[PDB]
């Protein structure tokens, strides 16, 4: 009955009190609404689709999760890495999680507008592709109402501020709920 979150800086709550981070809020909402889940946050700043893929098997073996939330690839895009390798790595992660017995939920991220639609979309479309291929659930716009917004982003315009954490949780819950 474990919900494993495998993310980067966004889910690790970079730049804020982790107890106020979206995953922390997830655990509190599960508790409040009388759901019986252990939330294991395995998010690490700096992580990439390749890094998450490399470290997932150990996590699956150790926790044997019923649900795996994957929030990776934001770094692949921010670094200008290849969109195709993102699709491969995420697909393989979703395959391996499903192989362990877990339902998979992908969190998709859109880079800031200044990257331009073609770049933004090149990575953004990958999430939908992986969900299609591996039959996963998907939140295509995890940063809806957060990205690009003033107050919601920290100054570097990538890492959500404290005020955004509720909204991050709002963005996942609806798509997560039916999986519980």
Residue numbers in the entry: 1 to 180
What does the paper say about this structure?
The GDSL enzymes have catalytic residues, namely Ser, Gly, Asn and His, located in consensus sequences designated as blocks I, II, III, and V, respectively. In the present work, we show that TesA shows lysophospholipase A (lysoPL A) activity with substrate specificity for medium and long chain lysophospholipids (lysoPLs), which are predominantly present in the bacterial cell membranes.
The crystal structure of TesA has been determined at 1.9 Å resolution. There are two molecules per asymmetric unit which are related by a two-fold noncrystallographic symmetry (NCS) (the root-mean-square difference (rmsd) between NCS related molecules A and B is 0.38 Å or Q=0.984; note: for identical structures Q=1). The monomer atomic model comprises residues 1-180 of the protein (light blue), no electron density was observed for the C-terminal His-tag comprised of residues 181-186. The compact single domain structure is comprised of a central five-stranded β-sheet surrounded by five α-helices and three 310 helices. The structure of TesA confirmed these residues as active site residues located on the top of the solvent exposed substrate binding cleft. Both the positioning and the orientation of the catalytic triad residues at structurally conserved topological sites classify TesA as a typical GDSL hydrolase. The structural alignment shows the presence of both waters in TesA, in identical spatial positions and with the protein environment comprised primarily of highly conserved residues.
